[PDB]
């Protein structure tokens, strides 16, 4: 699994941070790189094993057979996470960017320019 996408908006990412986390970004930035290169090279997908021959030369076939079935039916689940309220704290900090900043900032800019004619002059 995990068809991954690469760096999107990397110009915006690195170049502009929350001051209160600015350090973190570097740490997270470099962490990402680690994950990137590692995954790109190795995905976890093995073969499914040639039993037929193996049974021949694992003459303990009953073993081969029993283990064989249990494996082939076997399922490994989706391994666990630890962040998924982050998913949400995004939109919340995202409100702060936009709305919180959209509106408040938008008003500021409007007046300034509205003044600018007189003072531009």
């Amino acid at each position: 699994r995990k068809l991954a996408l690469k760096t999107i908006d990397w110009v915006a990412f690195g170049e502009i941070i929350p001051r209160n986390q600015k350090a973190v970004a570097n740490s997270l930035k470099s962490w990402n790189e680690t994950l990137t290169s590692r995954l790109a090279t190795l995905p976890e997908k093995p073969p499914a094993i040639d039993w037929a021959y193996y049974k021949a030369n694992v003459a303990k076939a009953g073993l081969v057979d029993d283990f064989e079935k249990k494996f082939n039916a076997l399922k490994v689940p989706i391994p666990e996470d630890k962040y998924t309220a982050q998913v949400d704290a995004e939109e919340k900090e995202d409100v702060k960017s936009c709305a919180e900043f959209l509106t408040q900032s938008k008003t500021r800019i409007q007046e300034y320019e509205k003044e600018l004619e007189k003072m531009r002059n």
Binding site: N57, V58, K60, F67
Partner: protein, 58 residues
């Protein structure tokens, strides 16, 4: 996790074929090694080939 399973079996059977070779080798060599001379004709077949050496060598 699977392969480890299988390889243990293989490796025993492989080793068992060699151990059967070593034990069979010792046993066959210990079984057949006796009445050789009781066939004096195994020195006749030497004499055989030896007259066919001393003839068929020149």
């Amino acid at each position: 996790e699977v392969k480890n399973r299988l390889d243990y079996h293989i490796s025993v059977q492989n080793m068992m074929r060699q151990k059967e070779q070593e034990h069979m080798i010792n046993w066959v060599e210990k079984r057949v090694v006796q009445s050789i001379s009781a066939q004096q004709e195994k020195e006749t077949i030497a004499k055989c080939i030896a007259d066919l050496k001393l003839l068929s060598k020149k």
